[model samples]
Target: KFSAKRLPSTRLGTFLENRVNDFLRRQNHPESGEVTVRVVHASDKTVEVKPGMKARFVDSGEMAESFPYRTKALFAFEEIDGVDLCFFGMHVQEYGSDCPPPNQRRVYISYLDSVHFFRPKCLRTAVYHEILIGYLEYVKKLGYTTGHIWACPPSEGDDYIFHCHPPDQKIPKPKRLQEWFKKMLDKAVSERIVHDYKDIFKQATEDRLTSAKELPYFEGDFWPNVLEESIKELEQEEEERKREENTSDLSQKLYATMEKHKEVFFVIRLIAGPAANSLPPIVDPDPLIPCDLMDGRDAFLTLARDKHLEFSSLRRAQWSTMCMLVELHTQSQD
Candidate 1:
């Protein structure tokens, strides 16, 4: 149970869920009417829970972008393939953590205006998109399915902008899965799943959301926040302050590189923020601009070298021939 029937505790949670759900229910998909479920052949690894367990733990939640709170071990199983699948809701923190942790990785869930799932970008995780599509398809399979019932609370789902569990809780299982994905999820996703946004150029030249979220994050990144979306995702406020106060040469050089290049090149157009390690970007970006440590040293270095070569190419003088993509984040209205 989530949303109108089950509400979130905090003001931000209530505010966000209101807009997201309201928009989806009435405004966004009215014309589209209905949609259904099909499998993509990932796998059905069975979880051993003694014998004849009521809910066999086949699969655990993959390393998803942070849910507002930590997830409980109880509700994290995937269903047995076929036979109408349904998984338990995520169990999150009951109270805000005793000490409020700095929520550096934040994204807007309909910042202002109305509520709806119109913008899949509002959600921080790409996993959520596929889950949404797959869930819809799966539910649509009900023999005589008529209406739709969508559910996800921050406490349960993590993306609705709330953290249900304490900040320190080690969500090792999911984190482990996420790590497995850190290296090559893109390879698997691209080959198999159809993404919500496929065009590689949408983020770099056009939309500001990616830039807005990414720029601030990367600006801090070029520190540890230190390496990629690391388990070592710790921040030293005092150290950071001292570094800023001194404006160390390396920091300046890194900051300067980004400052001169106001735009970030990401495909989908998704770029890595301050946090990421091995997320190889889909499209090779036009470098020469300060590039974030996207995916890894390999991709960033590759793009930089490519950009340098392209910059001096014979085709450089032809503005008309330059294949720069200038397209909007075209939302598919359902």
Candidate 2:
């Protein structure tokens, strides 16, 4: 029901015609035995097919100007010797260029603010677009609305705003197959649109929350006490490790650095202060060092260089345990 305006006259058209004929044959249509499909592109930007209907150009014109140059066509089948056929076209400037292999392309379905769903630009490929449209139509048969989704653009760092009629204005849910089909056709033309941000949607919600909670603690006061306790334990453990091993120059240097900069280990925590209490307390399983590493010196030094990073990585491994607490404190409104 959601059909494009113009159809191409290239091998792509023949491909579509063959597919339609195949479908008709499978449906056991009487006319399927008599008609053949052909594709043609006119100089007027119109696409005309023999034994089929014509389709006009649409939004793809603007897309051509902003992205790789391209033109498109949509076709609506009428009297194909008595059978109906629907098809569309996409002409791209990069059609024969040395682009990367198709499999290497990053294709994903994006939910853009509950309004638009976007497909990659290369969707002009007849085989791909036809398959996509067919799939969308199939889902439409199941009562899902496609207009609520927009194909996201393939470009990086592009943020498009989404706008749609409120829920009350949406089409009523379809109660029959025929009603669902009509709704799909109607939605294909409506213009309330939405945009998608690649990076924002790609990020895991849990990771973002973790980063936010840890940020405040990076410059707080409680951090210093936490680090100080961690560092002292590290030093004691390092001495014990050295006693048990034939010490190498690296080990001796590591111990000396730990002892000399012991004060700097807690610098981040002191600056951050107690107000930054969202972070987990720094804990050392062994009396001499934090639980992360057996000895206190290594743990102290890792935190000194990258306190937030160290803490977050540790917390990530223990997220399942922490998530329950977060969920209990955060209630669902509905």
Candidate 3:
């Protein structure tokens, strides 16, 4: 008989518990039962916990100065008979900061039937008053349910998303790039931040459920940090980003110079073709391709000198003259 108390069903706390037990069950624990979740801290507003990264993303940039933060997560434990069999932190977005209202920053969340459309990366807004005009319309489409029209911070692009799932079941997606000012145009609004997006966030604490018992966090306050050291073994990953295939500008010009007069090299082939048929006698039958600048120039000069460089021991000998040539392809000019 398992008697583990559960955290609020709405939070990821339950999500965390399921994940651990699933892990333990798979591990074949002798007596794997259930996991437990408890309230740690749900902040009325963001609480700074930098080392925890819950404080703010180090990349918050200019908006970090006034970026709004909403940090909330429940505690998770690998439960035992009486004492905590193991203490592990189960968490999700909980933050500490204040920032510009998303809507005021040229963001809006307009509604369509079922698509829940908005700007690409930056969603969520501080607008509370009229944003509802659309969400209420959306409720009808949603078969309008209680949590159907709720707000949550996204995981990237200074925006977050709608949610309802187990802990590991959720993650954020990013948007593509756009919005150009070609031909002297004003930069346009790329996406919409919804009405009451921030309003919901503003009143995040007004509701007892989200903020009532939320807690503040700090450093040296080690309670199963829940931070991922998953990649600490990354020392052997040999990770790297790809380099673009390219040449330096000078080298580009070098190739460009060759290309500019490709006709000349094409001519070189004409002057040398008869030599190939005759098997220009080189010690290595197939080893005479000019491999360097010096060698190539020497080969070219030899052609102008009208010399019989070499011939197969049995085949007819062939020679080159300054202007020896035959049929050739000069596509551009006569």
Q: Report the number of the highest-lDDT candidate.
A: 2
Candidate that beats the other on lDDT, 1 or 3, i.e. the better one: 3
Error of 2 at 45 (Å): 13
Quote model 2's TM-score. Answer: 0.23
| TM-score (all chains, Cα) for each model | 0.20, 0.23, 0.23
Give the clash count for model 2.
32
Q: Name the lDDT value of residue 207 in candidate 3.
A: 31
Over 4 Å off in model 1, which ranges? 1-8, 25-28, 31-222, 225-248, 260-262, 265-334
lDDT of 2 by residue, 178-231 (tens): 243333333322311111111112222222422111211111123223433444
Query: 1-334 in candidate 3: lDDT tens per residue?
Result: 1222522242334444454455455656465445554333333333233432332232444122223332333323333334232122212221211223221111112111111111111221111111222222322222211111112223432211111112332232211101111100111111221122212222233333221112122221221132212122121232331223322122232233334433221100111123223332212111111122112123323443344322211111111100111100111114
Best by TM-score: 3
Q: What is the C-alpha lDDT of each candidate?
A: 0.23, 0.25, 0.24
> How many residue pairs clash (N, CA or C atoms closer than 3 angstroms) in each of the candidate models, in the order given?
21, 32, 26
Deviating ranges (above 4 Å) for candidate 3: 1-8, 46-64, 82-86, 90-334
